[PDB]
Structure 1
Amino acid sequence: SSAGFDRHITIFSPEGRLYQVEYAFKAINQGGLTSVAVRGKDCAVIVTQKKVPDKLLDSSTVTHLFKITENIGCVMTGMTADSRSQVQRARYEAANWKYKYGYEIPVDMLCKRIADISQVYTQNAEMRPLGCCMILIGIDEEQGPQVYKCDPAGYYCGFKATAAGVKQTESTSFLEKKVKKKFDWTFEQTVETAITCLSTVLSIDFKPSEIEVGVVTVENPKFRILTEAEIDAHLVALAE
């Protein structure tokens, strides 16, 4: 049921639905990527990949793992053009938190502030809603690691393990059985599950060079990107 300009602008349908945000929801499928977010007890692991159509691609320039804070990394989905615009504003708001309040941002409030600006994109009909998907992590004092996600509905979200996107619907149901039972989560536990959820959906089992694996643990809280050399060690560790 549609009447008037409601297809072209942001308003309520005769049933109350919004058409623009539901289009932006499937806007991620045009990127053809997948992102899985798994959190352990002391750790949290983020795994993703990339497409290398030509041998001229630079692994460094096309890396999809972005780093907002020294202690807090992030990743995105869908088209990268929209994600990049959100990158600098994420960082800007981090720095203004550090300037105004004098201390590091919980990252809990970062997705909330960001989601408010996302509300503005949802509200005004004369500007693009920016349908890129924001996925973050964080570290809180004596709260362990934290995993957040943000979708262009103008709202904030964050759970234990959450995976949203093209093929993530199937990875979810796979994760729900692995989390519990009673299964505990350590470092190598999470790392080794990151590839299982990707294989069940894909089962390509390819060179570790295309996939990027982010992690956040409290040893040195500084976020770190894993080298292909060690990633291959975990990849041969899970296959006996």
Structure 2
Amino acid sequence: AGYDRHITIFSPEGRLYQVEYAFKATNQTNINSLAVRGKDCTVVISQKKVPDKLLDPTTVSYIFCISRTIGMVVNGPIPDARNAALRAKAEAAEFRYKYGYDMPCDVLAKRMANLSQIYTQRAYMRPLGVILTFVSVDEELGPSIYKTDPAGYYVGYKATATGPKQQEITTNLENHFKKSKIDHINEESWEKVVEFAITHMIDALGTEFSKNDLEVGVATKDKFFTLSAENIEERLVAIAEQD
């Protein structure tokens, strides 16, 4: 009754129950995220849910600036997220030092995926209950979106979404790209890509947002930055003219 349920070892079906549970743990935040590519930028969005009036809302964030050029957003409990964030920061700084150029989004993904895989094999260490969505405007590849999970799997993306409504959002986007017939948001300004993104979340979740119901990280050639509640209000104020 158990044992192959508590450590990172196979069941007779060939499964590691611990990894599956690490997946559950990613939804625990009850927060959804998405990322899309502009003609020359990358935008990620995560819902922000500050339910308690005591919390200083400006310290509640699931989006991180790992590198100057790489931003990462996390679906899962904050401690694990911080744990993964710090590690990815270290890795990008070290990679820089040893190889003479900025670590590119895909490589960091692969790197982190490989560490998550280790927890998959070793018994003493549990995998992290998170899903890491890295974004950048890569110097060789252009706008990048690569996301890793607790299984050590990682993969590139035209666009993507994660959380309790991963599925709902994902099909909203697929549809759009079937119609547009392209792998990105054909927009020159990043503000409009952001607007696109927010729009398509409202449409797939059936919920409307305040300025404090969202977090937006944007990646551009040479910088990844996150918007304030003010840079968001402007976006919203504009997507309210869109009909």
Per the TM superposition, whether the score is higher than 0.5 is yes
In the alignment, the residues of structure 2 paired with residue 146 and residue 4 of structure 1 have an alpha-carbon distance, to the nearest angstrom, of 41
Query: Match of 2:234?
Result: 233
In the alignment, the residues of structure 1 paired with residue 81 and residue 60 of structure 2 have an alpha-carbon distance, to the nearest angstrom, of 13
In the alignment, the residues of structure 2 paired with residue 223 and residue 70 of structure 1 have an alpha-carbon distance, to the nearest angstrom, of 6
- Name the aligned partner's letter for residue 10 of structure 1: T
Query: Match of 1:33?
Result: 31
Unpaired segments of 5 or more residues in structure 1?
Answer: none
The alignment's C-alpha RMSD in Å is 1.8
1:216-231 to 2 correspondence within 5 Å? 216-218=219-221, 221-231=222-232
Residue 71 of structure 1 deviates from its aligned partner by 1.7
Residue 126 of structure 1 deviates from its aligned partner by 2.0
Change (3 A) 1:142 1:17: closer
Partner of 1:117, secondary structure, is helix
Identity in percent: 56
- Name the aligned partner's letter for residue 106 of structure 1: P
Query: Match of 2:213?
Result: 210
Match of 1:105 among 97, 103, 106: 103
Residue 20 of structure 1 deviates from its aligned partner by 1.2
- Name the aligned partner's letter for residue 56 of structure 1: L
Match of 1:121 among 119, 122, 127: 119
In the alignment, the residues of structure 2 paired with residue 108 and residue 68 of structure 1 have an alpha-carbon distance, to the nearest angstrom, of 13
In the alignment, the residues of structure 2 paired with residue 139 and residue 200 of structure 1 have an alpha-carbon distance, to the nearest angstrom, of 27
In the alignment, the residues of structure 2 paired with residue 139 and residue 80 of structure 1 have an alpha-carbon distance, to the nearest angstrom, of 26
Query: Match of 1:85?
Result: 83
Would the aligned equivalents of 2:63 and 2:71 in 1 still touch at CA under 8 Å? yes
Query: Match of 1:62?
Result: 60
In the alignment, the residues of structure 2 paired with residue 100 and residue 88 of structure 1 have an alpha-carbon distance, to the nearest angstrom, of 18
In the alignment, the residues of structure 2 paired with residue 142 and residue 130 of structure 1 have an alpha-carbon distance, to the nearest angstrom, of 30
Q: So what's the TM-score if we normalise by structure 1?
A: 0.91
Unpaired segments of 5 or more residues in structure 2?
Answer: none
In the alignment, the residues of structure 2 paired with residue 5 and residue 21 of structure 1 have an alpha-carbon distance, to the nearest angstrom, of 14
Would the aligned equivalents of 2:41 and 2:136 in 1 still touch at CA under 8 Å? no
Residue 33 of structure 1 deviates from its aligned partner by 0.8
Number of aligned residues: 236
- Name the aligned partner's letter for residue 7 of structure 2: I
Q: So what's the TM-score if we normalise by structure 2?
A: 0.90
Residue 201 of structure 1 deviates from its aligned partner by 3.5
Change (3 A) 1:4 1:227: closer
- Name the aligned partner's letter for residue 229 of structure 1: E
In the alignment, the residues of structure 2 paired with residue 227 and residue 58 of structure 1 have an alpha-carbon distance, to the nearest angstrom, of 15
